[PDB]
Ligand binder design. Structure first.
Ligand code: MN
Ligand code: MN
Lengths: 335, 335
């Protein structure tokens, strides 16, 4: 009876897989090359991952059925098309988006989809964002933190955000590995990945977006952050408290709202990879129950424990319905 | 009659101030130079700060009295003596520690103190840690995240942690601005400081310490983190979950315990700069009430709101007493 819509569910498609296979052989210094080699490289350390990522109607659907999961909201897996040059990224984003729409239409009661884009070329990205919203009628958008080691405060990306805001599509900002601005401290102990780097990279991106005033410029933007908001919900009081010093002594711009007010107004979060009732309850309290969505983070996380996490959450049934799927249905235009 | 012991209370002394005024004029590229110029520069943007940091028995004690604060646990303010060359840092650490001991001894019912050291020279730091523990009988230790842009998983610092463990003194790892490994992303919107950079720098340091197996090598270390544990308490589930991948594919060493188990066994946290009852409640729930301590972060934060934050906390009186001062009395050897 509980409607479950998992909102951070990765997929890939052959043309992107082939491109990453070739890219894995190059001398790119980006920290994502660790993942890219492990999954897409010759002699990969994780040889089953491409199969599990590519599968939609086999193991994925059987697991959804076994666990009573109604839908996956699908996204091209990190690092998407962002590691390629502008020309290649742009070509592949179109291809990946068409394949995403095709995948969704084969089973639209079970799958919804986010389109992606190649912000290496902001004008072409804005055009693809319009095409995703209007021509393909996809459910929203996904991008994997930084592009070209720049964050989304940079005015270079204004045409992208202008297009996103006009489109009405929410943007899921998924992690990728720490950019070159920060990667040096994430080369050890597997910290390049989900264990630490992903969170630091993505949250820092989001915080720069807020403090730069991007949400005064584009106030109707809706951003979604996985991994219980990449911990930003935990830092809200300190973000607010220290903002006066930042504008006064630090040369940060004056904002109309407080940092945490942008977070509640313009962001929503998902529970991907943070199956903690305590953290879920914290987030509901400080963000409000309309701002928290459930996710699995399949195939990197197994479905069963993610499902049982939300089914057993110590919150009222109406709030649980919102988190399990009601909020996603609203935010990602799912019927 | 609630005993209030504030655990992250900054102070400075003339010999360190003079050293930092001189350092302010050098071409050090450290991100801390923004703070150092602002407070200690020839043309300071924050001219009253040196006076406020230096004052112990004037305005500080008066504010403590007005607000019913029993004690401050004093620490040489960031960046301590860690920006100097090895010889200079070593010399000033001894001098700062002697002055701290004398300051505590002058009003020992109102002030406790943490000694510091210069990790630039691990062998010399080890000796000063022993002196601090055995001869000055100070209450514990303080260091400001990185030294020379290295983190405390580095085996270079092993003689330091060997000494700390043996001394039985708890080490407060206070923030510093992001090291050169990560500072590129923290040059804008005032993010070098408390609003964002501090927490990312310090939490990353601690996470590296945990994942490197430092607490299998030194299982009796006690580390204290301010700012509600630099958000580490929020990330515990994901740290644990992803640790399997880190060791299997990421070359992280195999640990005896889970990451969150080191966090609970070897760390305690304080509420400095995070006056959120919701964040406080979360922390007590996931760490246990014995691992959370109150702090003010004076003079960077005012006393009254921090005091009223704990006096009004929606927790039982016995738990409130532990947080307000009881835990600190145990952890920092205060009668
Ligand atoms: Mn994911
Ligand atoms: Mn402090």
């Amino acid at each position: 009876s509980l409607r479950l819509i998992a909102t951070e569910e990765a997929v890939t498609f052959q043309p992107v897989v082939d491109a990453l296979r070739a890219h894995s052989r190059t001398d790119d210094a980006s920290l994502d090359m660790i993942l890219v080699r492990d999954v897409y490289g010759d002699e990969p350390a994780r040889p089953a991952m491409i199969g599990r990522l590519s599968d939609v109607t086999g193991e994925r659907l059987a697991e959804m059925d076994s666990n009573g999961v109604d839908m996956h909201l699908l996204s091209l897996t990190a690092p998407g098309v962002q590691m390629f040059d502008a020309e290649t990224g742009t070509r592949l984003a179109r291809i990946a988006n068409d394949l995403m729409a095709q995948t969704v239409a084969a089973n639209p009661t079970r799958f919804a989809g986010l389109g992606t884009f190649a912000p290496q070329d902001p004008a072409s990205a804005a055009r693809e964002i319009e095409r995703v919203a209007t021509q393909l009628r996809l459910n929203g958008l996904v991008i994997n933190s930084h592009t070209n080691d720049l964050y989304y405060d940079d005015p270079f990306f204004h045409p992208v955000f202008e297009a996103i805001e006009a489109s009405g599509l929410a943007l899921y900002i998924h992690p990728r590995a720490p950019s070159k601005q920060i990667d040096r401290a994430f080369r050890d102990y597997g910290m390049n990945s989900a264990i630490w780097g992903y969170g630091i990279e993505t949250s820092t991106n989001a915080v720069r977006m807020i403090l730069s005033g991007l949400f005064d410029r584009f106030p109707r933007l809706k951003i979604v952050l996985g991994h219980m908001g990449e911990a930003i919900p935990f830092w809200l009081w300190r973000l607010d408290y220290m903002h006066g010093n930042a504008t006064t002594f630090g040369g940060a711009p004056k904002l109309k709202l407080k940092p945490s007010e942008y977070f509640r107004r313009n962001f929503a979060i998902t529970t991907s990879g943070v199956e903690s009732h305590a953290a879920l309850r914290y987030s509901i309290e400080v963000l409000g129950p309309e701002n928290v969505m459930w996710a699995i983070d399949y195939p990197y996380q197994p479905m069963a424990p993610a499902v049982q996490f939300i089914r057993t959450a110590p919150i009222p049934e109406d709030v649980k319905a919102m988190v399990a799927g009601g909020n996603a249905a609203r935010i990602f235009r799912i019927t």
